[PDB]
Write a protein that binds this ligand. Structure first.
Ligand SMILES: Nc1ncnc2c1ncn2[C@@H]1O[C@H](COP(=O)(O)OP(=O)(O)OP(=O)(O)O)[C@@H](O)[C@H]1O
Ligand SMILES: C/C1=C/C(=O)O[C@@H]2C[C@@H](CC[C@H](C)/C=C/CC1)O[C@@](O)([C@@H]1CSC(=O)N1)C2
Ligand SMILES: *P(=O)(O)OC[C@H]1O[C@@H](n2cnc3c(N)ncnc32)[C@H](O)[C@@H]1O
Ligand SMILES: [Ca+2]
Lengths: 360, 351
């Protein structure tokens, strides 16, 4: 009876039931094969002797056998449900290729036999989770930092900007700058350790230059971390130097603009009459937004870029790491949304192309 | 539950006559299955919709609901008859008619494609050269594909304000042009045809992003065309460049009045002009046709015994159904947005 919600990601898949407040199964989006096949956490235990592939790259699905395997794992192994009995809502990256939408709809209706389903833009769900219909969502995750302006529930494709700058790149940058301090972090397990360090200790400095001056002139920011082997490492300025590769991508050898300038540009590609309601309704989402001080940094940067007489409000929910999935359960539990599902009858009539007319 | 879906759709506060007709036809065709006894009213309503005849189609829908009610839902019919008296049309936001006219223009292009030969445009090249002023260009290349003919006819834009002034001065109904002069600039858009940038759209009905003009309505002018004809999507205004095509076509007809198939040729020219001013967002269907149908401009076609098809097609079903799906999606989306807003205001009130 309950409608499943399956938010997909390059790193982590978040699956649960509508009406809840948090997903019941948040597991890695990986598939491993010997160097049979294993998915997610079961492929996590044998990472040394398995080839871990990421079927979602930069937010867009690239492998479809692997995605079928992940969805089979999500249904028959994580939620312990049968898709034939629930309407399976799904999430798509902004500016998703239409062939990919048709392929996911065909998979839902022809290999899992879901009675109904739907495909929503992840940033639109993140905007819904805050009780909004108009606003710009800065969805920064593990593979891509999308910037999606939305007007009355429609994600304007003429202003959606993409950024190949997300959590994985930040973890690699922290690995590099830890190697630049004498700590050998090159292998995979080193990547997991460095990602844990980044989650636990890193934060976005409100003033990068002043923070570097303070970190060089003192040791108050100097924090400690413990390896699995028992060794204790010490991280100083490197705490606020890793997330800065989102506001200054040149640190990673990228000619991009940074999440703040990407957001301002994506707002500037919009109509002048909806720019006031895009500034004051900036919603942050994704894991790579779970940085202390990132919201105030975004506030200051946008206030610098945006005009000097128009109010700006950066909206960072404490649950923003799940604003997509939350918005997918605030949606798949509404009474009106019960009329938006693509029935198996509608599929059998209109082919996999029904998704273009129903889920727009 | 189709009745529940239609009753939720009908609750929209931005519903207009176009959305009324589309939703009512969807409801009636879903309730009443494909029956030969009934497939003479649906096509009649499609034709009445295509011609901006909304009062007659509304009345026919209401009467068809009064009868046949034993096969319908009483509360849905009462909701239809309650919504109907209060509906209006906003020229700024006929966003179902915009989708319909865009898809119609695409279909009109596709059906002019099935024409035997493009000889009419090659013959029209000479008429264009004869009338093109000094401050213009000369066409010498042979036309072999539809795109070449489209660019050729669109090039008649150079004739404006030079040769068509005497034709505009004598013929009335243009002093009622309601195109705002204030240059609002351009804006990005991925919406084909005369659709607006910010409005929703299907993901298979998207065109590459480009700058489109931002044109407003001049409300100061009394009795504007957008007031006397509220039912037409305001794109730019009454089509002032169609007078250039008219001058070129008078020259062509005078040179070819004795042609055996001049009617088919002029119909091809006019249909391509109509389907090209919509497919590129300069003008909407009626913005061109209300110029083409002026009696002073109908005299030229009457003397040569020319029956203008005006782009009217024998099967406009596909874009009608696509507009039906568009309105269904929009209205259900508005209902869901209202439910979302109330569901969050309840939490705000509780804590
Ligand atoms: N507290 C935290 N602070 C900063 N970053 C974090 C935190 N927790 C997780 N992350 C990063 O967020 C990434 C995963 O976030 P998220 O699940 O939002 O992205 P995704 O949706 O899986 O990927 P995509 O956006 O490509 O679909 C991880 O790689 C991790 O490094
Ligand atoms: C805790 C956690 C979250 C996460 O973000 O993890 C996902 C999934 C993970 C690959 C699976 C790995 C073997 C174990 C799972 C860790 C899952 O790759 C990531 O860590 C990549 C590698 S470094 C980084 O920041 N993201 C993202
Ligand atoms: P209507 O004929 O009034 O046109 C209004 C504006 O649309 C532009 N326009 C009209 N016709 C063309 C062509 N053939 N090419 C490019 N632009 C065109 C004009 O700018 C009009 O102002
Ligand atoms: Ca995501």
């Amino acid at each position: 009876i309950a409608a499943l919600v399956v938010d997909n990601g390059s790193g982590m898949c978040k699956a649960g039931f509508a009406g809840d407040d948090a997903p019941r199964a948040v597991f890695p989006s990986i598939v491993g094969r010997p160097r049979d096949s294993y998915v997610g956490d079961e492929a996590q235990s044998k990472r040394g002797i398995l080839t871990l592939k990421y079927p979602i790259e930069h937010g867009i699905v690239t492998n479809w056998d692997d995605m079928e395997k992940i969805w089979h794992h999500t249904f028959y192994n994580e939620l312990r449900v049968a898709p034939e009995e629930h309407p399976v809502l799904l999430t798509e990256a902004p500016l998703n290729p239409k062939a990919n939408r048709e392929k996911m709809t065909q998979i839902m209706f022809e290999t899992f036999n879901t009675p109904a389903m739907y495909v929503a833009i992840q940033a639109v769900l993140s905007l819904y989770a805050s009780g909004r219909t108009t606003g710009i969502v800065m969805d920064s995750g593990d593979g891509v930092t999308h910037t999606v302006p939305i007007y009355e529930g429609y994600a304007l494709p003429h202003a959606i900007l993409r950024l190949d700058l997300a959590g994985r790149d930040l973890t690699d940058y922290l690995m590099k700058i830890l190697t630049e301090r004498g700590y050998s972090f090159t292998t995979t397990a080193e990547r997991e350790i460095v990602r844990d360090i980044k989650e636990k200790l890193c934060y976005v400095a409100l003033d990068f230059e002043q923070e570097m001056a303070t970190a060089a002139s003192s040791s108050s920011l100097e924090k400690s971390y413990e390896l699995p082997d028992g060794q204790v490492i010490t991280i100083g300025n490197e705490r606020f130097r890793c997330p800065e590769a989102l506001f200054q991508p040149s640190f990673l050898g990228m000619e991009s603009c940074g999440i703040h300038e990407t957001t301002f540009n994506s707002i500037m590609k919009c109509d002048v009459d909806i720019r006031k309601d895009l500034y004051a309704n900036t919603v942050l989402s994704g894991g790579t937004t779970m940085y202390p001080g990132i919201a105030d940094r975004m506030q200051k940067e946008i206030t610098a870029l945006a005009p000097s007489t128009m109010k700006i409000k950066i909206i960072a929910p404490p649950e923003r790491k799940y604003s997509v999935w939350i918005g997918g359960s605030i949606l798949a539990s509404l009474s009106t949304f019960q009329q938006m599902w693509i029935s198996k009858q509608e599929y059998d009539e209109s082919g996999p192309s029904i998704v273009h007319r129903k889920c727009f | 539950k189709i009745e529940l879906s239609i009753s939720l759709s009908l609750d929209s506060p931005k519903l207009d006559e176009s959305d009324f007709i589309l939703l009512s036809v969807k409801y009636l065709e879903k309730s009443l299955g494909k029956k030969k006894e009934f497939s003479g009213f649906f096509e009649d309503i499609e034709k009445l919709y295509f011609k901006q005849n909304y009062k007659e189609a509304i009345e026919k829908i209401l009467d068809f609901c009064k009868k046949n009610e034993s096969l319908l839902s009483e509360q849905v019919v009462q909701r239809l008859a309650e919504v109907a008296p209060r509906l209006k049309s906003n020229p700024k936001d006929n966003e179902s008619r915009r989708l319909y006219e865009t898809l119609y223009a695409d279909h009109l292009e596709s059906v002019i494609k099935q024409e035997s030969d493009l000889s009419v445009f090659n013959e029209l090249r000479d008429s264009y050269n004869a009338v093109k002023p000094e401050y213009a260009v000369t066409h010498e290349t042979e036309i072999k594909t539809l795109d070449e003919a489209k660019q050729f006819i669109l090039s008649f834009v150079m004739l404006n304000d030079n040769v068509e002034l005497p034709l505009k001065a004598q013929s009335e109904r243009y002093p009622k042009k309601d195109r705002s002069r204030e240059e609002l600039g351009n804006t990005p858009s991925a919406n084909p045809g005369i659709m607006k940038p910010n409005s929703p759209n299907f993901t298979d009905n998207l065109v590459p992003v480009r700058d489109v003009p931002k044109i407003a309505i001049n409300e100061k002018v009394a009795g504007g065309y957008s007031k006397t004809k509220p039912t037409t999507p305001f794109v730019a205004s009454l089509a002032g460049t169609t007078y250039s095509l008219m001058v070129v076509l008078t020259d062509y007809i005078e040179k070819h009045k004795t042609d055996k198939d001049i009617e088919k040729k002029v119909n091809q020219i006019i249909n391509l002009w109509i389907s090209s001013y919509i497919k590129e967002g300069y003008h909407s269907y009626s913005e061109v046709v209300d110029v083409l149908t002026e009696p002073f401009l109908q005299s030229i076609f009457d003397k040569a015994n020319i029956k203008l098809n005006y782009g009217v097609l024998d099967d406009t079903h596909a874009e009608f159904r696509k507009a039906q799906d568009y309105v269904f999606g929009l209205t259900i989306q508005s209902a869901m947005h209202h439910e979302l807003q109330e569901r969050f205001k309840n939490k705000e009130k509780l804590q």
